[PDB]
From Swiss-Prot, chain A:
Organism expressing this protein natively: Borreliella burgdorferi (strain ATCC 35210 / DSM 4680 / CIP 102532 / B31) (Borrelia burgdorferi)
Function as written in the Swiss-Prot or TrEMBL entry: One of the primary rRNA binding proteins, it binds directly to 16S rRNA central domain where it helps coordinate assembly of the platform of the 30S subunit.
Origin organism lineage: Bacteria, Pseudomonadati, Spirochaetota, Spirochaetia, Spirochaetales
Transmembrane segments: none
GO molecular function terms attached to this record: rRNA binding; structural constituent of ribosome
InterPro entries xrefs: Ribosomal_uS8 (IPR000630), Ribosomal_uS8_CS (IPR047863), Ribosomal_uS8_sf (IPR035987)
Keyword check for Ribosomal protein: yes
Quaternary assembly: Part of the 30S ribosomal subunit. Contacts proteins S5 and S12.
Top-rank taxon, per record: Bacteria
Protein name stated in the entry: Small ribosomal subunit protein uS8
Curated annotation (Swiss-Prot), chain B:
Residues recorded with modification 3-methylthioaspartic acid: 89
UniProt-listed NCBIfam families: rpsL_bact
Gene name in the database record: rpsL
UniProt-recorded name of the protein: Small ribosomal subunit protein uS12
Protein's GO biological process: translation
Family per record: Belongs to the universal ribosomal protein uS12 family.
Length: 132, 124
RNA sequence: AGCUAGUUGGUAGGGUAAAUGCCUACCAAGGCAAUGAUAAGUAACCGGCCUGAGAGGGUGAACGGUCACACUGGAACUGAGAUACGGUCCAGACUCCUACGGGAGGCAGCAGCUAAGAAUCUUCCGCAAUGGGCGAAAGCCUGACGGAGCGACACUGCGUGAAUGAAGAAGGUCGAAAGAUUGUAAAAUUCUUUUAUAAAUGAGGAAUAAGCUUUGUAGGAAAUGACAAAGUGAUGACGUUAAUUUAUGAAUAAGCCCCGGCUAAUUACGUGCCAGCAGCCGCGGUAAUACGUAAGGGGCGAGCGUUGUUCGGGAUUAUUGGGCGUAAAGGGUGAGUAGGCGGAUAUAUAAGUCUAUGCAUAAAAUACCACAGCUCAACUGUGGACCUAUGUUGGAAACUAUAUGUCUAGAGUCUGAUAGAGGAAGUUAGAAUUUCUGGUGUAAGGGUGGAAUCUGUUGAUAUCAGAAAGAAUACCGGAGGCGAAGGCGAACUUCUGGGUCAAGACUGACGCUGAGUCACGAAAGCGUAGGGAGCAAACAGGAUUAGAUACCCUGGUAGUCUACGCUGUAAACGAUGCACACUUGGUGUUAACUAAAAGUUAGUACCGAAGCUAACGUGUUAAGUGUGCCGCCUGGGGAGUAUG
RNA sequence: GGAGGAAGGUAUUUAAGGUAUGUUUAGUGAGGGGGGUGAAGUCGUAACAAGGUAGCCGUACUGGAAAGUGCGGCUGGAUC
RNA sequence: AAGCAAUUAGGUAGCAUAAAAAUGGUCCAAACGACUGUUUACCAAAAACACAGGUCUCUGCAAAUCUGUAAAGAGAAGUAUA
RNA sequence: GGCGGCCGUAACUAUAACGGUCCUAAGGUAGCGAAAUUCCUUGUCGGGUAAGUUCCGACCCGCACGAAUGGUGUAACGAUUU
């Protein structure tokens, strides 16, 4: 099967649905996927996400958010760390994505947290993805 | 991109630049004896008759060196100082004779760019 | 691509300040190696230096630390310390002195000579300061080190004047010979003296040592002495020191490269594809901004250019940060070892990661930031840090990793249904062709753009009947089907591989990719043994042509076919590796589910939206958005050659 | 008389030297082979148009030479 | 003396210790024949002959072939893989 | 069993890839070549030797090599020849 990304699969599905301009997208469900979508939700990139059922398997249905002119909120969403190339960073060397206009998402000792929260709590970890 | 695993197994190699002037043996310039002197016709579509010298160097190499400037007095057996520099016209000529060297002197009546042809300053 | 036979390990012993095949005697055959042994080539290493935004790349000058060597090759002695640069012994080469018996010598110490090279210094002063050796001390030694001289070799600073000064001197150059430009530049006037010369003044590197005076302490019967403290106390190679004050006066002082584009800077003469320039593109053949010389202009300046070498520009080895349909680049295809990577979820470990930028260690200098001292700078000194490298202490646990479980949606097994030139073996069939035999029958047949060779009066071709052999399977048959690929089409049986669908239960991540390796792999070719109708390299003849070692025609041997054993190459192509998660549609088609439509699923074709693409084109069977792993590319020729 | 003390003798190890066999590497060598530049000389016209026999790939044979042909494969092939 | 022996260690003796006799000379390159063999008894031992291997051709059995005027015999009490 | 001659021809000189012509059943391909074959000849050059008519490596002007009277090589073998 070599899924190789419970993370990149959802990222790619979300990216594709967002650019074609769908209303909702329907992802596999995991603790990290939930955490990431939660961070998106606070940051105002997605409207909401719900938990569901199909054939006894749980899904996450995410409500894509666009402006009134159908320009997506997500512009570019892309992975940094990667099974063949794992990228870790200290809390000082954390990149500020696009001069802060975007957000960085990392996995740290205290859970999956945004870059600003990682800086404010003085913790660092794996660089999951960058969204702007 | 090859995968990072591929780069680890078969690391990247940068190709090494190669000297244009191998007979100098990374010395700035060398000294030899003119085993022969002549003129040669260049490639197409140039015209002239360029003056060159077959020189046996102090390290045992043969080279063929151009003789810049107008006119010269290189006979046989004359010791010379070659430096780097390739003449595009001539095939196989890859070095220059230095004017003002041991047995070569400057070009007569040179007034612009004298130091490139080894001529003393004409007193004003 | 195999290496090692004191080689690997063991038991004793030799020896060492000390462990060990370090060495020896026996006992085993072991040890290392495609996770690179061994071998060859190259090289002292590091702090650092150069370059660069950084990551990196190149590099190991000076200075500091370690190592090795002191003519080449060994050996031991003395000694706390040497397998000893100016100690000893032996062998070898070289040099020198001999009375011929024999001896003496090692500048990779400081200078210096010869040779070599493009290329590098004085056969100098002093132990005043610092450091070291000996001594109670005075003191002695110190080519370490302090200084001087030499070289524009690099770095840094200063000067060669400064202020007034014409519609604007002479000349030079360009011009129509109005005038421009050199140009306030010069000249002239005024001012100044860093530098130059002379004189005067003149800090600091210096501390005092011995000795002497005095106080106090330990000691003691006590001085001499020792220690702690105060004072006195000769001493500078540099050195005519740094710096300072007057005296004379514009006095002592600029060159080099370039001017077509890259690249800041144009005109005039001479030359005429000659002479020459050039880093690249390229200029010169009678009007050269590119050659040569002048006039102007630009750059830098006691320097300016050239050459050699390194980095950068090069994202042109791309981790940061590149690709493989047609530009160089996807292996012919598959199965799999090592390796890499991998669903959901619980607990534990804390290797990775993160943190207290805890705590240490990363000598000094250098590198970064301030503050200081040389008239400033270079240079020098005192503090302060930024990284990131290792070790360690206490924590965090998401992710990777480790150990033990749980789940089913991935992947498999079982059940049912179903399509198919999938493969191998063994049988059978007909059409057509050729040959042979037997009839009918006569002069042509055959072939081309046109002919001829050839075949035929020994009965051709044509036609009828019979027999034999070989190879290949029209129609079905295609915008099909199956297989990993090559490939697979007359019919039947046997043996046998794979795929697809489903609530239809079971296992519970059992997976993806895959360097070596293995298997398969069109056609041609090779070995052995058969077979040989037709077709057909080589070859023969006839034509075309100047010629025809070809295209065309008539013949024709291998081969084409079968069995077994090799070869492993193709435009082996979709010129597009495999796998998974996603991303509008239109028109056909195959199979299945559904009675069938109608739709779905799994394929298979055409067109096409967005996107992508250098363009062509691609476009749910991506060349779109993401990743896992493997293969491969780094200008062309030489060259897929030479050699192994 | 220890002291085998110290010379001397003997023995092991060993440098240099000598002998033998393989092995790595740098010059040279009659002659031969292809490659590049100079030749614009000689012979032929293979490829680029349907290049005048469509082209090309693998293999085999043959020919002064470019090449020709047999077998299989490809379109990266006009025209209809 | 050790050791089962082969050998190992020490000592002794000589110019010489497989001490006598018996008991390979070796290396490099070329020509011819592959090779072991056979041949001119009595001047030629070889590069000649033979050889395994290869090709052509004959032979359907009262076979081809050979010896004889014949019968007959061999081929063969074999059968084209002969 | 057989497997040819003559003549002319290139940025010196040389040769002749090429062309013409006569004749034949067809005119020697691969490979080899002063050879167990080469008369001229001790051809020419290189190696070996102080000096090499022999020997080895080539050149091709093969009097008069040549493909089962086999051609060119070949590990091993030889009371063979050098």
């Amino acid at each position: 099967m070599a899924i190789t990304y419970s993370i990149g699969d959802m990222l790619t599905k979300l990216r594709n649905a967002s650019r074609v301009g769908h209303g909702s997208v329907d992802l596999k469900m995991s603790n990290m996927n939930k955490s990431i979508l939660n961070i998106l939700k606070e940051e105002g990139y997605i409207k909401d996400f719900n938990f569901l059922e199909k054939k006894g398997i749980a899904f996450i249905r995410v409500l894509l958010k666009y402006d009134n002119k159908r320009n997506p909120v997500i512009n570019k969403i892309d992975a940094i760390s990667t099974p063949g190339r794992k990228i870790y960073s200290s809390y000082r060397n954390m990149p500020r994505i696009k001069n802060g206009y975007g957000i960085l998402i990392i996995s740290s000792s205290q859970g999956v947290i945004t870059g600003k929260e990682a800086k404010d709590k003085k913790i660092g970890g794996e660089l999951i993805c960058s969204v702007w | 991109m090859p995968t990072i695993n591929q780069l680890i197994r078969k690391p990247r190699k940068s190709q090494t630049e190669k000297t244009a002037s191998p007979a100098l043996q990374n010395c700035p310039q060398r000294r030899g004896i003119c085993t022969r002197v002549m003129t040669v016709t260049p490639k197409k579509p140039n015209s002239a008759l360029r003056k060159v010298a077959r020189v046996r160097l102090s390290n045992g190499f043969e080279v063929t060196a151009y003789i810049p400037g107008i006119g010269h007095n290189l006979q046989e057996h004359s010791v010379v100082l070659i430096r780097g520099g390739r003449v595009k016209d001539l095939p196989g000529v890859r070095y220059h004779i230095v004017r003002g060297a041991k047995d070569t002197l400057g070009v007569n009546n040179r007034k612009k760019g004298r130091s490139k042809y080894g001529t003393k300053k004409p007193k004003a």
